Amino acid sequence: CMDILELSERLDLQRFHSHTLSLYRSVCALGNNRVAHALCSHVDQAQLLHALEDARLPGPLRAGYYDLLISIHLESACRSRRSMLSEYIVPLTPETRAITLFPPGRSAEDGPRRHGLPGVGVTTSLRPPHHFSPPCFVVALPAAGATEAPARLSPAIPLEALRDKALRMLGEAVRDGGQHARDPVGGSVEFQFVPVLKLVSTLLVMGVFSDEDVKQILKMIEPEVFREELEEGLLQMKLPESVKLQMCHLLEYFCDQELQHRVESLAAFAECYVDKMQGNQRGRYGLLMKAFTMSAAETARRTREFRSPPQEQINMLLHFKNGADEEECPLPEEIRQELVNFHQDLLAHCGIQLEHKPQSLQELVSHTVVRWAQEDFVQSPELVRAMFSLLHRQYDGLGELLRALPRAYTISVSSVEDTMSLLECLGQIRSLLIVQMGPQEENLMIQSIGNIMNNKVFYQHPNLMRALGMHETVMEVMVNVLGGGESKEIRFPKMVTSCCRFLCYFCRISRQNQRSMFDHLSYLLENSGIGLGMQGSTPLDVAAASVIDNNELALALQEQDLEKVVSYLAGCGLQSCPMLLAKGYPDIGWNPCGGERYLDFLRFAVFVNGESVEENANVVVRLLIRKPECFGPALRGEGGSGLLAAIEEAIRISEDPARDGPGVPPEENRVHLGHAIMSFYAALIDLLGRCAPETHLIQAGKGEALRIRAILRSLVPLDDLVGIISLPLQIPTLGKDGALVQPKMSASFVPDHKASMVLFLDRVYGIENQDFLLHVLDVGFLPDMRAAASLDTATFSTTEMALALNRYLCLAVLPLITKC
Amino acid sequence: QATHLRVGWALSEGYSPYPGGGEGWGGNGVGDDLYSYGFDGLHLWTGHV
Amino acid sequence: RLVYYEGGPVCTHARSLWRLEPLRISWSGSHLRWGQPLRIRHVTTGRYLGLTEDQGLVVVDASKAHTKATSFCFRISKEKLDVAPKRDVEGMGPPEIKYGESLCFVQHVASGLWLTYAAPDPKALRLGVLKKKAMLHQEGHMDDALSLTRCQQEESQAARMIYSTAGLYNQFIKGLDSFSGKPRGSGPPAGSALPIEGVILSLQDLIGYFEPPSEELQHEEKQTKLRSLRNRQSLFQEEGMLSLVLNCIDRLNVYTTAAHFAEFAGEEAAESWKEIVNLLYELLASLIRGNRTNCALFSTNLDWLVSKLDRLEASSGILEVLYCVLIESPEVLNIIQENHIKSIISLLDKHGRNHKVLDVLCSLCVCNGVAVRSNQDLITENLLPGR
Amino acid sequence: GVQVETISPGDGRTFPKRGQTCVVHYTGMLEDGKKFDSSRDRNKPFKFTLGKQEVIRGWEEGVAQMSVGQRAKLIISSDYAYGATGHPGIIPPHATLVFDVELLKLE
Amino acid sequence: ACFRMTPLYNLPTHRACNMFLESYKASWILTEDHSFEDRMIDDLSKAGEQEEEEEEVEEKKPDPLHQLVLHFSRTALTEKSKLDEDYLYMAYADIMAKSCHLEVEVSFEEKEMEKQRLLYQQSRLHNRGAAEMVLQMISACKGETGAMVSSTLKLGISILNGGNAEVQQKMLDYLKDKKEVGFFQSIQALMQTCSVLDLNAFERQNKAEGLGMVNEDGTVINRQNGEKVMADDEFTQDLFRFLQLLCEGHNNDFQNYLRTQTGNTTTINIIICTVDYLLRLQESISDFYWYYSGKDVIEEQGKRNFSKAMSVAKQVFNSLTEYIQGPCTGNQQSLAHSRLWDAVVGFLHVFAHMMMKLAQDSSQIELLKEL
Numbered sequence A: 001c002m003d004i005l006e007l008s009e010r011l012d013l014q015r016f017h018s019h020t021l022s023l024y025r026s027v028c029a030l031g032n033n034r035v036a037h038a039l040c041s042h043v044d045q046a047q048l049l050h051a052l053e054d055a056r057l058p059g060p061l062r063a064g065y066y067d068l069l070i071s072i073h074l075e076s077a078c079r080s081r082r083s084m085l086s087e088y089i090v091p092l093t094p095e096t097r098a099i100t101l102f103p104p105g106r107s108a109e110d111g112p113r114r115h116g117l118p119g120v121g122v123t124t125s126l127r128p129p130h131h132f133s134p135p136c137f138v139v140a141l142p143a144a145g146a147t148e149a150p151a152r153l154s155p156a157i158p159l160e161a162l163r164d165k166a167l168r169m170l171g172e173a174v175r176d177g178g179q180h181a182r183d184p185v186g187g188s189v190e191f192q193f194v195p196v197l198k199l200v201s202t203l204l205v206m207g208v209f210s211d212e213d214v215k216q217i218l219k220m221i222e223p224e225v226f227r228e229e230l231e232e233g234l235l236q237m238k239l240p241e242s243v244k245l246q247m248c249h250l251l252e253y254f255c256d257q258e259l260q261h262r263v264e265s266l267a268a269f270a271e272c273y274v275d276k277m278q279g280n281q282r283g284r285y286g287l288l289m290k291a292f293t294m295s296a297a298e299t300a301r302r303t304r305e306f307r308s309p310p311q312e313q314i315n316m317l318l319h320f321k322n323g324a325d326e327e328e329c330p331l332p333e334e335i336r337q338e339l340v341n342f343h344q345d346l347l348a349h350c351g352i353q354l355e356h357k358p359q360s361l362q363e364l365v366s367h368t369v370v371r372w373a374q375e376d377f378v379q380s381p382e383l384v385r386a387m388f389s390l391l392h393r394q395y396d397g398l399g400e401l402l403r404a405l406p407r408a409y410t411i412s413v414s415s416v417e418d419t420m421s422l423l424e425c426l427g428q429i430r431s432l433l434i435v436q437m438g439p440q441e442e443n444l445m446i447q448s449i450g451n452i453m454n455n456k457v458f459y460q461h462p463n464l465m466r467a468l469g470m471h472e473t474v475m476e477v478m479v480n481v482l483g484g485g486e487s488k489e490i491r492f493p494k495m496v497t498s499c500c501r502f503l504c505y506f507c508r509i510s511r512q513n514q515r516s517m518f519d520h521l522s523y524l525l526e527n528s529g530i531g532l533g534m535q536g537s538t539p540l541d542v543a544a545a546s547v548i549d550n551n552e553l554a555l556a557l558q559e560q561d562l563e564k565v566v567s568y569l570a571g572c573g574l575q576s577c578p579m580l581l582a583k584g585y586p587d588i589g590w591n592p593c594g595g596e597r598y599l600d601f602l603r604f605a606v607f608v609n610g611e612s613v614e615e616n617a618n619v620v621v622r623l624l625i626r627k628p629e630c631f632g633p634a635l636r637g638e639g640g641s642g643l644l645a646a647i648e649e650a651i652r653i654s655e656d657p658a659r660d661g662p663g664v665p666p667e668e669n670r671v672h673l674g675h676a677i678m679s680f681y682a683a684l685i686d687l688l689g690r691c692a693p694e695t696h697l698i699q700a701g702k703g704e705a706l707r708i709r710a711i712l713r714s715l716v717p718l719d720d721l722v723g724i725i726s727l728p729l730q731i732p733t734l735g736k737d738g739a740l741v742q743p744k745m746s747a748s749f750v751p752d753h754k755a756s757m758v759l760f761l762d763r764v765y766g767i768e769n770q771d772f773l774l775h776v777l778d779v780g781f782l783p784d785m786r787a788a789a790s791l792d793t794a795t796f797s798t799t800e801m802a803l804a805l806n807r808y809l810c811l812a813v814l815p816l817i818t819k820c
Numbered sequence B: 001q002a003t004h005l006r007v008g009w010a011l012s013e014g015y016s017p018y019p020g021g022g023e024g025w026g027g028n029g030v031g032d033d034l035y036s037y038g039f040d041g042l043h044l045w046t047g048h049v
Numbered sequence C: 001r002l003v004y005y006e007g008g009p010v011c012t013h014a015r016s017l018w019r020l021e022p023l024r025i026s027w028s029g030s031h032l033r034w035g036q037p038l039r040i041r042h043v044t045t046g047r048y049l050g051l052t053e054d055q056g057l058v059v060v061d062a063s064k065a066h067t068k069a070t071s072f073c074f075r076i077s078k079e080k081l082d083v084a085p086k087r088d089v090e091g092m093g094p095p096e097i098k099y100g101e102s103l104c105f106v107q108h109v110a111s112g113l114w115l116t117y118a119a120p121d122p123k124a125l126r127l128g129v130l131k132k133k134a135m136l137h138q139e140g141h142m143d144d145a146l147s148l149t150r151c152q153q154e155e156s157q158a159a160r161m162i163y164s165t166a167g168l169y170n171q172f173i174k175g176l177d178s179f180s181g182k183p184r185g186s187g188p189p190a191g192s193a194l195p196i197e198g199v200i201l202s203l204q205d206l207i208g209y210f211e212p213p214s215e216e217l218q219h220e221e222k223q224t225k226l227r228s229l230r231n232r233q234s235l236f237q238e239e240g241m242l243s244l245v246l247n248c249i250d251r252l253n254v255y256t257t258a259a260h261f262a263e264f265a266g267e268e269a270a271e272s273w274k275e276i277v278n279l280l281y282e283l284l285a286s287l288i289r290g291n292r293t294n295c296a297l298f299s300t301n302l303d304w305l306v307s308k309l310d311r312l313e314a315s316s317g318i319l320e321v322l323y324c325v326l327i328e329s330p331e332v333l334n335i336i337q338e339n340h341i342k343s344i345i346s347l348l349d350k351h352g353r354n355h356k357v358l359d360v361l362c363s364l365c366v367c368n369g370v371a372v373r374s375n376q377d378l379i380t381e382n383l384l385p386g387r
Numbered sequence D: 001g002v003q004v005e006t007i008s009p010g011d012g013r014t015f016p017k018r019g020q021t022c023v024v025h026y027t028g029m030l031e032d033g034k035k036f037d038s039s040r041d042r043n044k045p046f047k048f049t050l051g052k053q054e055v056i057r058g059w060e061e062g063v064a065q066m067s068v069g070q071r072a073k074l075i076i077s078s079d080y081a082y083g084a085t086g087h088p089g090i091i092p093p094h095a096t097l098v099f100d101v102e103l104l105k106l107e
Numbered sequence E: 001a002c003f004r005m006t007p008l009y010n011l012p013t014h015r016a017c018n019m020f021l022e023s024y025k026a027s028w029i030l031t032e033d034h035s036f037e038d039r040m041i042d043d044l045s046k047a048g049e050q051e052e053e054e055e056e057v058e059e060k061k062p063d064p065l066h067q068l069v070l071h072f073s074r075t076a077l078t079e080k081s082k083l084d085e086d087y088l089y090m091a092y093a094d095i096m097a098k099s100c101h102l103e104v105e106v107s108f109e110e111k112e113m114e115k116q117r118l119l120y121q122q123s124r125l126h127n128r129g130a131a132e133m134v135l136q137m138i139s140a141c142k143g144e145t146g147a148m149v150s151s152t153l154k155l156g157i158s159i160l161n162g163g164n165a166e167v168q169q170k171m172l173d174y175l176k177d178k179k180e181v182g183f184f185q186s187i188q189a190l191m192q193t194c195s196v197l198d199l200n201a202f203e204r205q206n207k208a209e210g211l212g213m214v215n216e217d218g219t220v221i222n223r224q225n226g227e228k229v230m231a232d233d234e235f236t237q238d239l240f241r242f243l244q245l246l247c248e249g250h251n252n253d254f255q256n257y258l259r260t261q262t263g264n265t266t267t268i269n270i271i272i273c274t275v276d277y278l279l280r281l282q283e284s285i286s287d288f289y290w291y292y293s294g295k296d297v298i299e300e301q302g303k304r305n306f307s308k309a310m311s312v313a314k315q316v317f318n319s320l321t322e323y324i325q326g327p328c329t330g331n332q333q334s335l336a337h338s339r340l341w342d343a344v345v346g347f348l349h350v351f352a353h354m355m356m357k358l359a360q361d362s363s364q365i366e367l368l369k370e371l
Helices: A004-008 A011-027 A033-042 A045-053 A059-084 A094-098 A159-179 A189-206 A211-221 A241-290 A296-307 A310-318 A333-350 A361-375 A381-395 A397-407 A413-431 A439-454 A462-468 A470-483 A493-509 A511-518 A521-527 A539-545 A551-556 A559-574 A578-583 A592-606 A614-626 A643-655 A673-691 A695-700 A703-715 A718-726 A751-765 A770-790 A800-819 C153-178 C196-209 C219-239 C241-253 C258-265 C273-288 C292-299 C302-310 C315-328 C330-335 C338-351 C355-365 C373-383 D057-065 E013-029 E037-045 E064-077 E087-099 E108-126 E130-141 E147-160 E165-178 E182-193 E199-210 E233-247 E252-257 E270-293 E300-324 E329-337 E340-359 E365-370
Strands: A088-091 A408-411 A733-735 A739-741 B007-010 B036-039 C018-022 C038-042 C047-052 C056-060 C072-075 C103-108 C114-117 C132-137 D003-008 D021-030 D035-038 D046-049 D071-076 D097-106
Touching: A004 A011, A011 A033, A011 A059, A011 C355, A011 C373, A033 A059, A033 C373, A045 A059, A045 A159, A059 A189, A059 A413, A088 A241, A088 A413, A094 A241, A159 A189, A159 A211, A189 A211, A189 A241, A211 A241, A241 A296, A241 A310, A241 A333, A241 A361, A241 A381, A241 A397, A241 A408, A241 E013, A296 A310, A310 E013, A333 A397, A333 E013, A361 A381, A361 E037, A361 E064, A381 A397, A381 E037, A381 E064, A381 E087, A397 A408, A397 E013, A408 A413, A408 A462, A408 E013, A413 A439, A413 A470, A439 A470, A439 A493, A462 A470, A462 A493, A462 A511, A470 A493, A470 A511, A470 A521, A493 A511, A493 A539, A511 A539, A511 A551, A521 A539, A521 A559, A539 A592, A551 A614, A551 E199, A559 A592, A559 A614, A592 A614, A592 A673, A614 A673, A614 A703, A614 E199, A643 A673, A643 A718, A673 A703, A673 A751, A695 A703, A703 A751, A718 A751, A718 A770, A751 A770, A751 A800, A770 A800, C038 C072, C056 C132, C153 C196, C153 C219, C153 C241, C196 C273, C219 C241, C219 C273, C219 C292, C219 E064, C241 C273, C258 C273, C273 C292, C273 C315, C292 C302, C292 C315, C292 C330, C302 C315, C302 C338, C315 C330, C315 C338, C315 C355, C338 C355, C338 C373, C355 C373, D057 D071, D057 D097, E037 E064, E037 E087, E037 E108, E064 E087, E064 E130, E087 E108, E087 E147, E108 E130, E108 E147, E108 E165, E130 E147, E130 E165, E130 E182, E147 E165, E147 E233, E165 E252, E182 E233, E182 E270, E199 E270, E199 E300, E233 E252, E233 E270, E233 E300, E252 E329, E270 E300, E270 E329, E270 E340, E300 E329, E300 E365, E340 E365
Parallel strands: A088 A408
Antiparallel strands: A733 A739, B007 B036, C018 C038, C038 C047, C047 C056, C072 C103, C103 C114, C114 C132, D003 D071, D021 D035, D021 D046, D021 D097, D071 D097
């Protein structure tokens, strides 16, 4: 062994050891808390703190050890806090109510020339706590298996000691820089300052520093601008560009703190003002009720406000910025004046209201940035961008608040715990965006998504969820894994299933959520090419949920998205499924399962709220006829066997083994091809029937509607529909010693296949002739009704086939007979 | 680190435990080379064993 | 040996570069005229477009490219204007054909057939085969005119360099295969002479060609040079020079040391074995450096690279190639395995303390802000606990 | 396993009992002599409760054998330690552990 | 619905707080007008203490505004597959564009002084390389429509307003020196992406508007969305205004360069691209006229779509006029041989029939005036 300080002259070992520290940082980088715990053995906190204190250490090793400390102990918490710092969830607590824009001061309580010290005071925005675990290497190794144990937390280091040490080091560095010594710590001013400033910035972002510590930091930055009622500060000390970048980071943190203070003060004023407004409106309603209000028109005009939606009431009540009479805006002068005074105070705080000394954070930042740019031609693009972003924020702080407000949200005290849990889960999900997905990350993501869905706040505050943007984060994870080896079958199928389920449920929660997920429809359709490997929810399911039963979104649907879906359908109808071929299924030439999935999406696209969307139906029909392979081999004109013949052939295939299955399973022998063909054809007929024009349009004699109906009639003959409806259905029967012989619904003709045909027959062909009604009733409906009635015994009543027959009747057949 | 205390004999030429790093993990005293022979209360030290 | 109409990135690749060669040697650079007989040459392959009695339109070799087979002409229209004669004129001559604007029909002067696209074959649409075979037909189609687009000087030079380098390296590979399995013992090399000097000079020239731009250059100039370098690397690897370099490396690696190579090739050839191997590795590194598409090619054959890391003739070059691949391609990182990580740690163990191996491990850990937890765990477990 | 050698004597009367918290300073080294853990480096005593299986069998039994105020060397075999799996990144698989353990007090 | 009565005072405090924040942002904070662009540009332009630095070097170090423009030029010049959206660049481009204000009968002196003031304001920018930055960003966008290219075009228009000859010469010199096809390729792509009147989108929007809301406004989306028809009319007008301002003042060098770029390996006929877009717009307008011919009166939505389409057409006509005026004989010949005549014929047909139809009714007097 030698003294590590010998590496100042032993350059080769110095380079190797610096790169070794870099390797430690890399192995524990981006949230590998277990590896950080492992490294805590190789480089203990005693070594790390001694390295922080050491002044004779070479510059590269000093920087490496500072960065190693940050990586091992602080990097993950810093990343999580930084990610959550952009959103402002402020609870309505007494601490929140106490917040004000300007500190209560002797010169003026509100709107003085004196801002409060940035980053000092009370902040109520919800940020999840920091979680650490002791670095102990004698504890029992968990008996749990792989991925069962919770993800390891970052190793713990004494934070109070660390913050005190960082402050002392920064003060010593400032003093030495003032002294202008010929031997700077680390061999250079950059090596002396950049590590200490990096540590201080990390601790500030983590929020460990107290109010006194922040005051000391601010005084180091500027003894004059930040003072309480030596001259050289950091911002005026002739620093290199890296140190200037670190100072820019510190100034960015303090500007962000000022913005957070503005947002919190706005939220508190909003609480007080809205309480006053609600009390006033209740009193006004009481006066209106107590008044006889003989004037019917006058009372109606008064009650229009109360009958208007609450958001409209708020807008009308606040619409007095330029003045308004009582009639236009029924708000009292005192209540108006309170808002006017708060607006004046907010403008003053933002600096909108308009000496060589800065005397404020904003003047300080602007003057410092301009002075740096004037003094030197900055050669660092990162430094240039940082200072100019700071300058832009400071010149337009009102725009900064305007852009920040969308992420602001107010919650009641009761919801604080659930919101904190949701923030924990969202932070885990966000952290999982910077790591290649594996089994453990998959398990963590699934657990986080499940916890978020179970969380109550996910229901009550969908606007908060959209502001947090967790839907985009979940989609980012899903699309990362989907693109990863896109041609190859996607790994981690269950995580994609969970993400698709979460997104579908998010769409179901609220209409605005549906719009937000619809905005990303084309991309979901892009990734929908590969599917059915999950056997659960899919990006195509997410796309369908993004538009289901939403007439506005269906109208907004794009023709190019429709063509993309139709092209996927054509491909499925032209080529067999590689997955089935690999499994060993017979090659039938086309892909009924994918065809059915895309047909279901097209059905959801065209049919909304029990009525057909004419535009989408026409577009879909035109695209399908343009690509005839979508209809399947049976309906293909040149050699098509016909719909009835195709259904009969599918029945024969289902009956015959080795033609519907591999015949060399997680669910019902995977897919039975006999059932799959019938399902595809039933879905196609259902989609066409839905695309069928409406009766009112037909009566109006719209040329487009008549043309579309004629096209559909040409595509689907009526005799084929009648015959398919007439096809017999296998029914349960007692056999052997009372043992029940039931058809396998997943592998045989089922009543839903007939229900699709009935829907098409009713919507397109319709029943208008008594002779035809009696014919169809005698041939196809009455036998099924009688079978359902005969299956009403105790033994057969609850059978799946009997229940399917009941659903088929009540949904398709009986309503048709009622109409006719 | 535990306090170091060893008593013994050493040879005039060869026993030069310069301060700082050295053989093993540093802190060289009596018995950390083959020129000294020390007793720490529980072990007999010589050759750094 | 067949010609197609294709519309992918081939419009930017060098495989679609043709050179117009008028039959006249003197004043061959004169302005091209309608009806002038000329030969169209494929730059990268050095083969001339022509007509054969057995396969119709094909690209024939220079030896077989006689005037009757390979003579073509550009014509304004498909009318029977061929009766009109024309005499060559000394000088640049009248400017007739214009880049881009002019639309011209290619006609075989001897047969008189027109260059057109063959009728699409069935099931090609479902295969997705965009390329459509081109063939000479008596009548042709209405949309047969071809637009002429000039290629940049760098592209033309790259195509010619690819042609020459492919010829040279194919000759080198053939020479090596000549004596691959024949032990010399004591006597003549027992094979065809190797183009050692030509290969060395070509490798040096190509390394200079692919030298990355200097850092000291201004940002705009550096960006332009980087664009040119990426384009040239893409051209070469599309034409397959990277695979050719890999084949040469395999043939040379078949021999463990210079004496082992001499046992089969002779002392004079063996004297340049280590130099050629090092130059080949340097050229591979230059080709792949900074090019994600080129680096991702090593995902399929990563073991090919890792297994060679212990070789002592070009250890630094192999490490440099691995470093470039890992820095650029995240797919390689995703496919890394414990055996590869242990091999890199064995490089640390056997070749001493080199910070470049540590850099390689750091690159393995994280790429483009995304961490490979499996790689981090494997590196930690296989390197740290030993101390 | 676990072997105990008394580096310094203790009171010799008070011994840990099940369900009683033990406070210790420990320095952990591999059988080769490489140090991998030490509570003195963190400057915070390690506290663990006997009978809760919070530490490995070697600690359980060895510390149960020690008396209050005693410093001892504990040699723990792989079976009585992390064993075949080991502690990835810290303890190599199948490693014997040597600990210098001082039992400060019982709470 | 009256019995429901949906009072605000009954709503929980937190929901009312959130709605109040939204309304206050929309009506009070957003409506507030703050003018800081000119002050910021002046402060950044000013360079201080230069006498104290005592720099005798011929090339004085760039002032902060110059450094900002150089940084954005560096970002544009950096090679990438796509131009990543940059809020800082968009904000600073907006600030620079607003710096050039372009602000009773004004006298000859007053007009000349206003022109000189605008020239000085545009000099503050194009002396720092703003024209080169604009060209570089337009090249970098690679034909992808978005806020980045919109801000770049707005800044270009701001610096080129009034036919700035110095800016025009700087842009020409930069383009001819670089000899890069990316700029005109991106311009052609942007024109191809520029949209026209869409009757299917109009019908879909009409059906959506016909669909109404029964729940609360604070609960429903309220069917408030960007117009589906002629959504990017502002961007189209900006593009064609930039191209017009290039040739403004009868700059024969642009009037020839836009038609043919000699130095470049490949050329793009921007004149013919403009003619093609005009033909597309004329066909769309003719279709929309045919849609409304049967109806007796055009409703307000139809009038609005007419106004947007005819504003875009007016801008395109002005662009063509500036292309050919001076006169530029090459551009004149190119347009004469282009498909401009078909567009003019279609426009004449639409003009006559719209004239008659809109004259039949008085409510359409403004639309008739614009036509």
